[PDB]
Design an enzyme around this catalytic site. Structure first.
Site, mmCIF file in Angstrom:
data_model
loop_
_atom_site.group_PDB
_atom_site.id
_atom_site.type_symbol
_atom_site.label_atom_id
_atom_site.label_comp_id
_atom_site.label_asym_id
_atom_site.label_seq_id
_atom_site.Cartn_x
_atom_site.Cartn_y
_atom_site.Cartn_z
ATOM 1 N N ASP A 79 -5.780 -1.018 3.729
ATOM 2 C CA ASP A 79 -4.684 -1.496 4.580
ATOM 3 C C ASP A 79 -4.254 -2.873 4.079
ATOM 4 O OD1 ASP A 79 -2.820 -1.179 6.700
ATOM 5 O OD2 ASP A 79 -4.158 -2.352 8.029
ATOM 6 N N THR A 80 -3.015 -2.950 3.588
ATOM 7 C CA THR A 80 -2.424 -4.268 3.320
ATOM 8 C C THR A 80 -1.674 -4.759 4.536
ATOM 9 O OG1 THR A 80 -0.534 -3.113 2.216
ATOM 10 C CG2 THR A 80 -2.231 -3.917 0.810
ATOM 11 N N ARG A 134 3.724 11.423 3.517
ATOM 12 C CA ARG A 134 3.352 10.589 2.375
ATOM 13 C C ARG A 134 2.205 11.206 1.648
ATOM 14 N NH1 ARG A 134 2.640 4.826 5.360
ATOM 15 N NH2 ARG A 134 1.000 6.134 6.266
ATOM 16 N N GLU A 165 1.552 -5.949 6.576
ATOM 17 C CA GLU A 165 2.960 -5.622 6.472
ATOM 18 C C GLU A 165 3.689 -6.814 5.899
ATOM 19 O OE1 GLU A 165 4.178 -2.480 7.213
ATOM 20 O OE2 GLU A 165 2.094 -1.905 7.713
ATOM 21 N N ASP A 209 0.785 -1.253 0.000
ATOM 22 C CA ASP A 209 0.000 0.000 0.000
ATOM 23 C C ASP A 209 0.799 1.277 0.000
ATOM 24 O OD1 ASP A 209 0.698 0.261 2.621
ATOM 25 O OD2 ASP A 209 -1.243 -0.472 3.428
ATOM 26 N N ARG A 249 0.949 6.785 -0.042
ATOM 27 C CA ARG A 249 0.160 5.800 0.679
ATOM 28 C C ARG A 249 -1.230 5.759 0.059
ATOM 29 N NH1 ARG A 249 -2.839 2.663 3.087
ATOM 30 N NH2 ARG A 249 -2.534 1.903 5.263
HETATM 31 C C1 LIG Z 1 -4.214 5.675 4.764
HETATM 32 C C2 LIG Z 1 -4.002 6.775 5.820
HETATM 33 C C3 LIG Z 1 -3.092 6.590 6.820
HETATM 34 N N1 LIG Z 1 -2.839 7.619 7.708
HETATM 35 C C4 LIG Z 1 -1.959 7.369 8.915
HETATM 36 C C5 LIG Z 1 -2.828 6.682 10.067
HETATM 37 C C6 LIG Z 1 -1.828 5.723 10.724
HETATM 38 O O1 LIG Z 1 -1.126 6.442 11.792
HETATM 39 P P1 LIG Z 1 -0.160 5.613 12.772
HETATM 40 O O2 LIG Z 1 1.182 5.500 12.094
HETATM 41 O O3 LIG Z 1 -0.065 6.558 13.963
HETATM 42 O O4 LIG Z 1 -0.756 4.234 13.032
HETATM 43 C C7 LIG Z 1 -0.846 5.364 9.581
HETATM 44 C C8 LIG Z 1 -1.216 3.978 8.987
HETATM 45 O O5 LIG Z 1 -0.325 3.763 7.830
HETATM 46 P P2 LIG Z 1 0.308 2.389 7.588
HETATM 47 O O6 LIG Z 1 -0.803 1.360 7.431
HETATM 48 O O7 LIG Z 1 1.100 2.671 6.286
HETATM 49 O O8 LIG Z 1 1.195 2.024 8.806
HETATM 50 O O9 LIG Z 1 -1.014 6.402 8.585
HETATM 51 C C9 LIG Z 1 -3.489 8.764 7.633
HETATM 52 O O10 LIG Z 1 -3.304 9.732 8.454
HETATM 53 N N2 LIG Z 1 -4.328 9.026 6.584
HETATM 54 C C10 LIG Z 1 -4.605 8.016 5.673
HETATM 55 O O11 LIG Z 1 -5.453 8.272 4.819
HETATM 56 CA CA LIG Z 2 -0.214 -1.283 5.930
#
Ligand SMILES: Cc1cn([C@H]2C[C@H](OP(=O)(O)O)[C@@H](COP(=O)(O)O)O2)c(=O)[nH]c1=O
Ligand SMILES: [Ca+2]
EC number: 3.1.31.1
Length: 129
Positions: free
Chosen positions: A34-35, A75, A37, A15, A29
Site C-alpha cells: 500500500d502506497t 485491476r 495516495e 501502486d 495493482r
Molecule cells: C492489493 C489488493 C487490493 N484489493 C482491494 C481491497 C481494497 O478494497 P476497497 O476499495 O473496498 O478498500 C482496495 C485497496 O486498493 P487501493 O489501495 O488501490 O485503494 O483493493 C484486493 O481485493 N486485492 C488486493 O490484492
Molecule cells: Ca494505495
C-alpha cells in the site's frame, strides 16, 4: 511463479500502473503493498518512484501469484518487475509502501517484502521517519 511479458502504457501512482499484457490494456495493482495516495504524505514520492522505475525499465514483466488475478475493480493483481527488479519490493525497501493487503493464497512474496520493510524501518526511511 512465472514472469510474463508486458509493456508500459502509463504510470498512474505509487501502486498502480497501466500495462499492455497479452496485447490488451490493463490497470495493475501491485500485490502485497500500500502506497500513500497522491494527496497524502509520501504519495507524490511513491508515485515518482514507481514512474521512474517503470519508465526507465527496458523489460517490464508481470508475475501473477497462485490466487486471484484480478480484483473487484477489474485491476490485475501481480508482482511487477523492471529489468528484473521487483517494483513491489523496491517500494517497501525504500519506505514508500507498507506491506498490506496480504490475502491467503496470493502471498508468495510476503516474507521477502516483510524483510524489506524491517530494513526500511530500521533505517527510518520515508514513511518510517
Ligand atoms: C492489493 C489488493 C487490493 N484489493 C482491494 C481491497 C481494497 O478494497 P476497497 O476499495 O473496498 O478498500 C482496495 C485497496 O486498493 P487501493 O489501495 O488501490 O485503494 O483493493 C484486493 O481485493 N486485492 C488486493 O490484492
Ligand atoms: Ca494505495
Amino acid at each position: 511463479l512465472h514472469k510474463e511479458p508486458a509493456t508500459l502504457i502509463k504510470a498512474i501512482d505509487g501502486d498502480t500502473v497501466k500495462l499492455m499484457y497479452k496485447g490488451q490494456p490493463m490497470t495493475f495493482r501491485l500485490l502485497l503493498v500500500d502506497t500513500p495516495e497522491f494527496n497524502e504524505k509520501y504519495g507524490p514520492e511513491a508515485s515518482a518512484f514507481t514512474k521512474k522505475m517503470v519508465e526507465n525499465g527496458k523489460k517490464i514483466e508481470v508475475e501473477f501469484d497462485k490466487g486471484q488475478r484480478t480484483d473487484k475493480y477489474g485491476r490485475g493483481l501481480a508482482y511487477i518487475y523492471a529489468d528484473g527488479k521487483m517494483v513491489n519490493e523496491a517500494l517497501v525497501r525504500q519506505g514508500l509502501a507498507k506491506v498490506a493487503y496480504v490475502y491467503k493464497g496470493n502471498n508468495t512474496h510476503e516474507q521477502l517484502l516483510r524483510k524489506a520493510e524491517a530494513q526500511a524501518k530500521k533505517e527510518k526511511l520515508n514513511i518510517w521517519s
